[PDB]
Amino acid sequence: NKCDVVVVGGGISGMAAAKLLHDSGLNVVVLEARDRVGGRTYTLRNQKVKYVDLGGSYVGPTQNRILRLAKELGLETYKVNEVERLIHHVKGKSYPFRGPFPPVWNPITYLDHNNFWRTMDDMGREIPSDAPWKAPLAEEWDNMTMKELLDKLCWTESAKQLATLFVNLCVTAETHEVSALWFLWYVKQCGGTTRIISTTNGGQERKFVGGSGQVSERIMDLLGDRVKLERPVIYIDQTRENVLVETLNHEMYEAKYVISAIPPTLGMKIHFNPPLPMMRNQMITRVPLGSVIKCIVYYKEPFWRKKDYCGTMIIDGEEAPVAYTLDDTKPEGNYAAIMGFILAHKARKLARLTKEERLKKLCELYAKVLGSLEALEPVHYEEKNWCEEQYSGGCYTTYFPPGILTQYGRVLRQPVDRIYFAGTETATHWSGYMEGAVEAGERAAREILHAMGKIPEDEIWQSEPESVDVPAQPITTTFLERHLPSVPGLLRLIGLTTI
Amino acid sequence: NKCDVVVVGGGISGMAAAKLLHDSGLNVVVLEARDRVGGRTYTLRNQKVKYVDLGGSYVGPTQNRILRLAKELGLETYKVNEVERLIHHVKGKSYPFRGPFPPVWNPITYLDHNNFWRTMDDMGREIPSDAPWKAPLAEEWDNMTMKELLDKLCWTESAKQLATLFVNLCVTAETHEVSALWFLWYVKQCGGTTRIISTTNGGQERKFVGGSGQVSERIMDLLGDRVKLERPVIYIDQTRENVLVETLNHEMYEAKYVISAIPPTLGMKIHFNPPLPMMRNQMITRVPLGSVIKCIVYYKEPFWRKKDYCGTMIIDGEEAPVAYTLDDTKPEGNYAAIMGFILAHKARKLARLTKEERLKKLCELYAKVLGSLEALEPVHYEEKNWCEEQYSGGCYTTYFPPGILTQYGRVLRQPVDRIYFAGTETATHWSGYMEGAVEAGERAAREILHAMGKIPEDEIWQSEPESVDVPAQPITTTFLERHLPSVPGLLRLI
Ligand SMILES: *Cc1cc2c(cc1C)nc1c(=O)[nH]c(=O)nc-1n2C[C@H](O)[C@H](O)[C@H](O)COP(=O)(O)OP(=O)(O)OC[C@H]1O[C@@H](n2cnc3c(N)ncnc32)[C@H](O)[C@@H]1O
Ligand SMILES: *Cc1cc2c(cc1C)nc1c(=O)[nH]c(=O)nc-1n2C[C@H](O)[C@H](O)[C@H](O)COP(=O)(O)OP(=O)(O)OC[C@H]1O[C@@H](n2cnc3c(N)ncnc32)[C@H](O)[C@@H]1O
Ligand SMILES: CNCc1cc(=O)oc2cc(OCc3cccc(Cl)c3)ccc12
Ligand SMILES: CNCc1cc(=O)oc2cc(OCc3cccc(Cl)c3)ccc12
Task: Check which CATH number belongs to the domain holding A67 and give it.
Answer: 3.50.50.60
Task: Check which CATH number belongs to the domain holding B117 and give it.
Answer: 1.10.405.10
| Interchain CB contact of A244 with B (< 8 Å) | no
Radius of gyration of chain B from its Cα atoms, rounded to whole angstroms = 23
Nearest-atom number in ligand 1 for the CA of A294 is: 8
Shortest Cα–Cα distance, A434 to chain B (Å): 22
Structural domain includes residue A324: yes
Which of B273, B274, B126, B97 minimizes the C-alpha distance to B192?
B126
Do A157 and A306 reside in the same domain of the chain?
no
Task: Check which CATH number belongs to the domain holding A323 and give it.
Answer: 3.90.660.10
User: Of all protein residues, whose CA lies closest to atom 23 belonging to ligand 1?
Assistant: A433
**Residue range(s) defining the domain that contains residue A249:** 1-39+61-76+209-287+401-461
Question: How many Å lie between the centroid of ligand 4 and the Cα of residue A251?
Answer: 49
CB contact under 8 Å between B278 and A388, yes or no, is yes
Structural domain includes residue A483: no
Shortest Cα–Cα distance, A166 to chain B (Å): 18
Residues of B in contact with A147 (CB under 8 A): 143
Pocket of ligand 2 (CB under 6 A): B 8-14, 31-34, 39-41, 55-58, 232-233, 261-263, 266, 269-270, 292, 294, 386, 391-392, 395-397, 423-424, 432-435, 437
Ligand 3 pocket member A165 (CB < 6 A): yes
Q: Which residues contact A499 (CB under 8 A, 6 or more apart)?
A: none
User: Of all protein residues, whose CA lies closest to atom 20 belonging to ligand 3?
Assistant: A166
Do A283 and A407 reside in the same domain of the chain?
yes
Shortest Cα–Cα distance, A333 to chain B (Å): 36
Do A349 and A204 reside in the same domain of the chain?
yes
| Interchain CB contact of A401 with B (< 8 Å) | yes
Rounded Cα–Cα distance for residues B244 and B3 (Å): 11
Rounded Cα–Cα distance for residues A3 and A252 (Å): 11
Structural domain includes residue B381: yes
Note the resolution in Å, 1 decimal: 1.7
User: Which of A:2-41 have CB within 8 Å of B?
Assistant: none
Do B248 and B309 reside in the same domain of the chain?
no
- Best mutation site among A252, A284, A286 for testing chain B: the one with the most B CBs within 10 Å? A286
Residues of B in contact with A268 (CB under 8 A): 265-266, 268-269, 285
What are the φ/ψ torsions at residue A311 (nearest 5 degrees)?
Answer: 120, -10
Structural domain includes residue B53: yes
Residue A106 near residue A90 (C-beta atoms within 8 A): no
Do B318 and B394 reside in the same domain of the chain?
yes
- What b-and-e string marks burial along A345-381, b requiring 16 or more CB atoms within 10 Å of the CB? bbbbebbeeeeeebbebbbebbebbbebebbeebebb
The reply to whether omega before B274 is within 30° of 0 (cis) is yes
In degrees, rounded to 5, the angle at the alpha carbon of residue A297 between the alpha carbons of residues A294 and A300 is 155
Rounded Cα–Cα distance for residues B311 and B366 (Å): 10
Q: Which residues contact B264 (CB under 8 A, 6 or more apart)?
A: B283, B284, B287, B398, B412, B421, B423, B425
Torsion of CA B161, B162, B167, B170, to 10 degrees: 150
Q: Which of B281, B394, B402 comes nearest A388 by C-beta?
A: B281
User: Of all protein residues, whose CA lies closest to atom 21 belonging to ligand 1?
Assistant: A56
Shortest Cα–Cα distance, B174 to chain A (Å): 8
Q: How many CB atoms lie within 10 A of CB B122?
A: 11
Shortest Cα–Cα distance, A15 to chain B (Å): 23
Pocket of ligand 2, candidates B20, B30, B41: which has the most ligand atoms within 8 Å of its Cβ, to mutate?
A: B41
Q: Which of A144, A269, A407 comes nearest B345 by C-beta?
A: A407
Structural domain includes residue A492: no
Rounded Cα–Cα distance for residues B346 and B292 (Å): 8
CB contact under 8 Å between A145 and B145, yes or no, is yes
Domain limit, last residue, from B384, B400, B416: B400
User: Of all protein residues, whose CA lies closest to atom 22 belonging to ligand 1?
Assistant: A433
CB contact under 8 Å between A388 and B277, yes or no, is yes
Do B396 and B295 reside in the same domain of the chain?
yes
Residues of A in contact with B343 (CB under 8 A): none
Torsion of CA A327, A207, A189, A196, to 10 degrees: -20
Structural domain includes residue B312: yes
| Interchain CB contact of A352 with B (< 8 Å) | no
Query: Could you give the number of structural domains in chain A?
Result: 3
Do B193 and B304 reside in the same domain of the chain?
no
Do B379 and B264 reside in the same domain of the chain?
no
CB contact under 8 Å between A402 and B177, yes or no, is yes
Domain limit, last residue, from A400, A415, A447: A400
Q: How many CB atoms lie within 10 A of CB B327?
A: 22
Sort strands B243-247 and B252-255 into parallel, antiparallel or unpaired.
antiparallel
| Per-residue CA distances from B104 to A163, B112, B197, B322, B460 (Å) | 43, 10, 17, 22, 46
Question: How many Å lie between the centroid of ligand 4 and the Cα of residue B372?
Answer: 24
Rounded Cα–Cα distance for residues B431 and B437 (Å): 7
Query: Which DSSP letter does residue B272 get?
Result: E
Residues of A in contact with B248 (CB under 8 A): 234-235, 271
Q: Kindly tell me the sign of the dihedral angle through the C-alpha atoms of B407, B413, B419, B425.
A: positive
Residues of A in contact with B402 (CB under 8 A): 145, 176-177, 401-402
Residues of A in contact with B282 (CB under 8 A): 288-289, 291, 387, 393-394
Question: For B125-212, where are the alpha helices, taking DSSP H only?
Answer: 138-142, 146-153, 157-171, 180-188, 193-197
Do B272 and B419 reside in the same domain of the chain?
yes
Radius of gyration of chain A from its Cα atoms, rounded to whole angstroms = 23
Ligand 3 pocket member A101 (CB < 6 A): yes
What are the φ/ψ torsions at residue B3 (nearest 5 degrees)?
Answer: -155, 180
Do B267 and B320 reside in the same domain of the chain?
no
Rounded Cα–Cα distance for residues B139 and A177 (Å): 12
Structural domain includes residue B264: yes
Residue of A nearest to B263 (CA): A285
Residues of A in contact with B264 (CB under 8 A): none
User: Of all protein residues, whose CA lies closest to atom 10 belonging to ligand 3?
Assistant: A197
Alpha carbon A181 to its chain centroid, in Å, reads: 17
Do A303 and A387 reside in the same domain of the chain?
yes
Residue B292 near residue B347 (C-beta atoms within 8 A): yes
Shortest Cα–Cα distance, A429 to chain B (Å): 25
Q: Which of A276, A282, A403 comes nearest B394 by C-beta?
A: A282
Q: Kindly tell me the sign of the dihedral angle through the C-alpha atoms of B107, B113, B115, B118.
A: negative
Ligand nearest to the CA of A212: 1
3-state secondary structure string, chain A? CECCEEEECCEHHHHHHHHHHHHCCCCEEEECCCCCCECCCCEECCCCCCCEECCCCEECCCCHHHHHHHHHCCCCEEECCCCCEEEEEECCEEEEECCCCCCCCCHHHHHHHHHHHHHHHHHHCCCCCCCHHHCCCHHHHHCCEHHHHHHHHCCCHHHHHHHHHHHHHHHCCCCCCCEHHHHHHHHHCCCCHHHHHCCCCCCCCEEECCCCHHHHHHHHHHHHHHEECCCCEEEEECCCCCEEEEECCCCEEEECEEEECCCHHHHHHCEEECCCCHHHHHHCCCCCECCEEEEEEECCCCHHHHHCEEEEEEECCCCCCCCEEEECCCCCCCCCEEEEEEECHHHHHHCCCCHHHHHHHHHHHHHHHHCCHHHHCCCEEEEEEHHHCCCCCCCCCECCCCCHHHHHHHHCCCCECCEEECCHHHCCCCCCCHHHHHHHHHHHHHHHHHHCCCCCHHHCCCCCCCCCCCCCCCCCCCHHHHHCCCHHHHHHHHHHHCC
User: Which of B:108-147 have CB within 8 Å of A?
Assistant: 143-145, 147
Structural domain includes residue A477: no
- Best mutation site among B147, B248, B286, B425 for testing chain A: the one with the most A CBs within 10 Å? B286
| Interchain CB contact of A451 with B (< 8 Å) | no
Do A373 and A293 reside in the same domain of the chain?
yes
Q: Which of B268, B282, B289 comes nearest A387 by C-beta?
A: B282
Ligand 4 pocket member B58 (CB < 6 A): yes
Pocket of ligand 4, candidates B90, B95, B161, B169: which has the most ligand atoms within 8 Å of its Cβ, to mutate?
A: B169
Nearest-atom number in ligand 2 for the CA of B394 is: 1
Residues of A in contact with B287 (CB under 8 A): 285
Which of B242, B268, B269, B240 minimizes the C-alpha distance to B256?
B242
